[PDB]
Amino acid sequence: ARLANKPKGTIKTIKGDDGEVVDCVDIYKQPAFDHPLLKNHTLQMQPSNKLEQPWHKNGECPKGSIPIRRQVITGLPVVKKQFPTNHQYAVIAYFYGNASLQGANATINIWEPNLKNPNGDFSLTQIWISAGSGSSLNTIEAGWQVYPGRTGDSQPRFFIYWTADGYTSTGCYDLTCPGFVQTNNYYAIGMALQPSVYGGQQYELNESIQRDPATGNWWLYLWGTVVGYWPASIYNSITNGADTVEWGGEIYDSSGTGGFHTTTQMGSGHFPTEGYGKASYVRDLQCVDTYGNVISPTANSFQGIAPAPNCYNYQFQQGSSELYLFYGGPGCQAIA
Template sequence: MASCDHNRSPITRIFVSYLVLVLVSSSLAPVVLSISTDHPVQSNQTFRSAQELLKLKRIRTHLTRINKPPLKTIQSPDGDLIDCVHSHHQPAFDHPLLQGQKPQDPPERPQGHNPRNRVSESFQLWTLSGDSCPEGTIPIRRTREDDVLRANSIRRFGRKLAKPVMRDSSSSDHEHAVGYVTGEQYYGAKASLNVWSPKVADRYEFSLSQIWVISGSFGDDLNTIEAGWQVSPELYGDNYPRFFTYWTSDAYQTTGCYNLLCSGFVQTNNKIAIGAAISPTSSYDGGQFDISLLIWKDPNHGNWWLEFGSGLLVGYWPSELFSHLREHANMIQYGGEVVNTSPSGSHTSTQMGSGHFADEGFGKASYFRNLQVVDWDNSLIPLSNLRVLADHPNCYDIQGGINSVWGNYFYYGGPGNNEKCP
C-alpha cells in the first residue's frame, strides 16, 4: 500500500483523501444523531419516574399522618371508608398548641336554644347499614391516594385556593349569594338550611351552602369558622352533597382546612362523620330536607362549638387556633358560594343551591330560615339588620324576608350560565 501510494500524483492523493473523509463523515453522522436524540428522552423518562416516585412517597407520608389507626372500619354505600379512631388520637392533637390535650366536656348551650324536631341520626349514607362507631371513638372519612392526587399539590390538599369571602369578591372566581350582619360583637350563629344536590360542571369547581363566623380585617389576618354542606368533585371525587367544616386564621393562606384533613378541629361525636355524604336531600317541587347548625363560643373556655340538628354536638374549634376569634366575631354570613372557572370563556353552569332563582320560592329555591346570632350574654337573639347581597344576581340571586314562623329567612341560588348571566 505504501509503494502504491507513493506512485500517485499529489492531486490524486488529495482526491482520495477527500473521498475517504466524506465516506467516513457520512457513516458517522447517523450515529452522532442517534446519540443526541435518544439520550435526552431516556434522561427525561428517568427524571419523570423519579419525580413521580418522590410525589407518591410524600403523599403516602401525608396519608400516614392524617389517617389514624382505626379500631374499626365501616364501608359506606357510596364507597367511602369510615374509620373509627380513638378520640384522643384524632388529627387535632397533632397541632403544636393542642398536643397532650384531650377532648373537652360539652359547654352550656346558649339561652333561648329550644331544640325541636330532632334530626334523625341516619342522615349520612355510611350509617344506613346500622353499623356505628363505638363510644370513645370518632368516625373519620379515610383519605386515599386518589383524593390527594386530584389536588393541585399536597400542600393545597384540603384547602380553599382563594379568598372565598363576600368582601371584594367581584374580582374573584368565588361567587356568593349571602345574607349577613355586621357592626356588632357576635359570639355565635344559628340557622336551618335545606340540602340539595347541585350540578357542578367542572371538577375544579364546587357549590356550597354554609354559615361563616368571621373576625379580623379582610386582609391577611382574616379569621373564619365555617360549616354547612358542599358538592366538591375535586375534594371528594364525586357529586354527593357532604357535611363539612372549615377554618382559617390567616385568610386561607397557610392555616386551616376542610374537615379533619389537618390538625385543628376537635371532634367529640361518634355518630357524625365530617365530610361524609348527606342523605336524603331536597327535591324540586317535592320533599324538603333541611339541617340546623349552631356555632357558638363557650363563655368559660373560649372554644367555638358546633351543634348539628337538635342536640348532636359535633365538636369544637379550639380558641388557640385563632387571633381575632379568641375574642368575638365582627361579621356573620349565611348563604351560598360557587367557584366559577369560566370554562370555554363563558360563565360556569355550576348550580348554587337547587339551581333555581330565589323568586321560585318554597319547594323550588334553596333557603336559610330562623337566622339568629349569639350575643355577649350567651343568648340566641333574632337578627335586627340582615342585609342580602349577590355578587352576580343574573347568575345567582337572593331575596330576604321575615315572618312569624321562619323569623329572618331568605331564598337564594341559581343556575349559573343562562341568557342573562354573562
C-alpha cells in the first residue's frame, strides 16, 4: 500500500512507469556496510555487467552507485523463511559428505503460479546452498517468488535470502537488512521476471553461485553477469564451502491446511508429468567440488522432499544434454 522511506546514501531516485521505485545508493553506503561483522569495509569490486530491466527507460544509476528497489509496505505479515507446518515442498537435495562444495548452479523456469489466498500465501522456486545444522545452519539462497504480502503484487520476482543461525535472528530477503553486498550498477534485485506461457514461450532464471577461494566471499551471477556477493564475514559454518544443495519449489499455505488442502500453485500449477512447456522445471543441476570440478549428480544421487505428493510433487526427465527436474502442481482441492 505505501512505499518505505528512501535508504541512507541515496544519490538519485528513479520512478518506473508501473509504480516501481529505484534508489541509486552510493556503493559504499549500501545496507551491507551497517553490519557489525562487516567493519572490514574493503569492497571486493570484482571476483578474483549490464542486465536490462524496464525502469532503465526512465533513467540509470550513476557510476559508484547501485540500484535498490524501494520496499512496498503492504501492512500484511511476512512469515519466517524455512529450510526444506504450513509450508509445502517439492525439492531435491544433494547431500555432500563435508562442507567443501565451492558453488552451485540453477536454471529455473519462471512462472506466475496462482495463489488461493493472496494476502498471506506465497509460492517460490529457488536454490538453497547450506552448511551446518540447527542454530548453526548457514544458507545462500536465490530464486523467484510470488508473495503479494511482501512485494506488493502477484508477479514472480527475483529474490535472494541468507541466514547464519538457521533463521533464528539473522538474515533477510534481498537488501532489506545488512548482509549481501551488491556490486552491479544496472540490475535491481526484487523486480518482476517474465513468466512463461502454458504451451508457449518458456523463460528461465539462470543463477550461478561461486565461492572465491582467495576471500571466501560467495559471488552471485545471473545469466553469467556478476550481481554481488554474500561476504564470508557474515557466516560461520559455510565460510569454507557448503555441505548441502537443494533445488525446487515451495508454497506457504496461510489457510492452515498444512499445504494439503489448498489450490495455491507450485511451479506452473501443473504436475511434472505434463512436461516441457506445461510443468515448471529446474535444469543445470550442478555443483563445484573442493578441487574446482563441476559435478552433475545423477537422478539417483538426490533425495526427494515432497511431503504432499497428491498436491505437489517432482519428476526427473533425462534431457539430450542434461538432467531436468520437473516439479510443482495445482495443490489439492479444499473439502466443503
